[PDB]
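Thread: assembly with ligand

MN 10:42: here's the input set. Chains plus the small molecule as SMILES. Want everything predicted jointly, not piecewise.
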Amino acid sequence: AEHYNLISWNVNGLRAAVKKGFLDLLLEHRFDIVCVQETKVSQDKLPREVKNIQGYYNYFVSAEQNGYSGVGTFSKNKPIKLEKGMGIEVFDREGRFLRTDYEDFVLLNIYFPNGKMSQERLGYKMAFYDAFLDYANALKSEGKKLVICGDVNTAHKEIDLARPKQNEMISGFLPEERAWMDKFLAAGYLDSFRMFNPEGGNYSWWSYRTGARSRNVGWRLDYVFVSENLRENVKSASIYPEIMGSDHCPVGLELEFV
Ligand SMILES: [Mg+2]
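BT 11:07: finished. Tokens for the full assembly:
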């Protein structure tokens, strides 16, 4: 396994997205790894069409709350280790985190919390960010190569959304959230899209408000990060705005080893 083409997508409900192209994306076999966030799958009851996909292994975690959160990873290769959650109950019970190790790297697939509903959920989001950073840093200390994909639910810089000056009081673009992303990258991680493309207008989420996606009034909420030790392995990093069916579009990257 010299090459990995990875795609990551918040589907805003997996059952619904299966009728709107997700199955096409998976069954095309274009991607070595397909990560989905926000499956909204209750009690491990996956859509039948997803259950016995062929040529892919698949792994899912569900939240305790039904119809909420949930993430899954499909891969052509069988992981050498599977861990559902970071090992902290108050975060693991929301089904936001799925680890799959491969021979060449550790993959963390994450649906980071949205902080808009309340102060308490903004607090939870920031606490989740802290736990995640400590978790990733411990693996990095051990010499793992880390790939982290998913929906961070924050636009890092002003260039990462179309209307920054309308959104500074909104979770998603709060100074403290952006500051946490600064702290994360400074610990030795790379925003893969920005390894190759410095330009604005590159978003991965748009409101369902009429015409917002057509007018590209968007936010870049979805990322793939790599630990610095993977810099020379990253050959491309993409956003896929042509893929419909959710309020987010996919993002991805390509790795090459050996
Ligand atoms: Mg959603």
